[PDB]
Amino acid sequence: MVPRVPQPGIWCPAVTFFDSKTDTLDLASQERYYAYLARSGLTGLVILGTNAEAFLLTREERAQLIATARKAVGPDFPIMAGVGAHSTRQVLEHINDASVAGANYVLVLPPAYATTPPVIKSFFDDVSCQSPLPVVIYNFPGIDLDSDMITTIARKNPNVVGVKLTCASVGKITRLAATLPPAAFSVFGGQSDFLIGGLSVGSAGCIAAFANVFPKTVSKIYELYKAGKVDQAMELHRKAALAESPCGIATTKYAAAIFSAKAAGIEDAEEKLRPRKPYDPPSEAAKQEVRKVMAEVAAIEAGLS
């Protein structure tokens, strides 16, 4: 069974497939893709993160994706669902939808419509208390939450079980560790390129966009660190950080289309991984860059899977 407090490890915030002719979710492809990712050494999936274009989805689509995730991975693989919105009412509706659809945890943005600090504090208090699922603070700056607010929120709310920091520092991680024991609270960095130092000071690890593209490689990096084989870990980490260069959403979707989605046997992956209307796909030149810059890590991934 999935623990109350999210397991340290490597998590992937999965991209979203759209049938472009009808502008609807492509759930058959989505299920194939989620299942492939969960079978590539990942600790868990983040569904409806920012990479999934969650804010472009209807409430019903959000719930279908969570349910599709659960079906793809089975009952023993952790799912963290993004639920962020503008009001407490919307957040609670998303949370309850997530709970019914099978999520284990909910990942919650602070309210943004730049809000004040007692507003942030009372929001998280109200949300943790009402939420049927354990809560991970989603810090994506839009306001930025320092160590003081996070610790305050966590100490008052035992249903708060972690934080995703998007731009995590070694200082920030350390401060959190010193005040919040790991058994009750998991810190996640959002950067694969942070994870070298990220884990060396006791993060719970990482929620990495790039694990969409080469999940086995990103998991190998983590696995080598936990084995103490720190020499080859850093050498592989280096290569992977190099390949991660291209960054936002449209480029990531396209990389997944030509690497992981193809590996998952999804046909026409490139059309299905266009950004949702009316947003445009990457330029030809952006696409050429992806293929050149990621070719080496692709060969490594074909070697590990």
Nearer to Cl ion, 100 or 302 (CB): 302
Active site residue 71: no
Write out the binding residues for Cl ion, residues 137-176 only, by CB under 5 A.
none
Which residues ranging from 225 to 244 are in contact with Cl ion (CB under 5 A)?
none
C-beta of 132 vs 303, nearer to Cl ion: 303
Can you tell me the distance from the alpha carbon of 62 to that of 103, in angstroms, rounded to the nearest whole number?
A: 12
**Backbone breaks in the chain after residues (C–N over 2.5 Å):** 113, 141, 247
Amino acid at 229: K
Q: Catalog residues that contact Ca ion under the rule CB under 5 A.
A: 302
**Chain-centroid distance, C-alpha 8:** 13
CB of 302 to Ca ion, least distance (A): 5
Q: Is 305 in the site for Cl ion (CB under 5 A)?
A: yes
Nearest Cα neighbor of 4 from 189, 218, 161 is 161
Which listed option, Cl ion, Ca ion, none, makes contact with residue 27 (CB within 5 to 8 Å by class)?
A: Cl ion
- State yes or no: residue 31 binds Cl ion (CB under 5 A): yes
| Region binding Cl ion by CB under 5 A among candidate stretches 37-45, 149-157, 219-227, 255-263 | 255-263
Catalytic annotation, pick one of 164, 172, 216, 220: 164
Q: Which member of 207, 263, 273, 294 binds Cl ion (CB under 5 A)?
A: 263
> CB of residue 265 vs Ca ion: minimum separation in angstroms?
14
Nearest residue to Ca ion, by Cβ distance, number only: 302
Give the residue among 137, 2, 23 at the shortest CA–CA distance from 78. 2
Which one of Ca ion, Cl ion, none is in contact with 178 (Cβ closer than 5 to 8 A by kind)?
Answer: none
Phi, psi of 188 (to 5 degrees): -120, 135
261 binds Cl ion (CB under 5 A): no
**What angle, 0 to 180 degrees and rounded to 10, lies between the N-to-C axes of helices 59-73 and 27-38?**
40
User: Contacting Cl ion (CB under 5 A), which of 2, 5, 27, 143?
Assistant: 27
Query: In the complex, which residues of this chain contact Cl ion (CB under 5 A)?
Result: 27, 31, 263, 302, 305
Residues designated as active site:
164
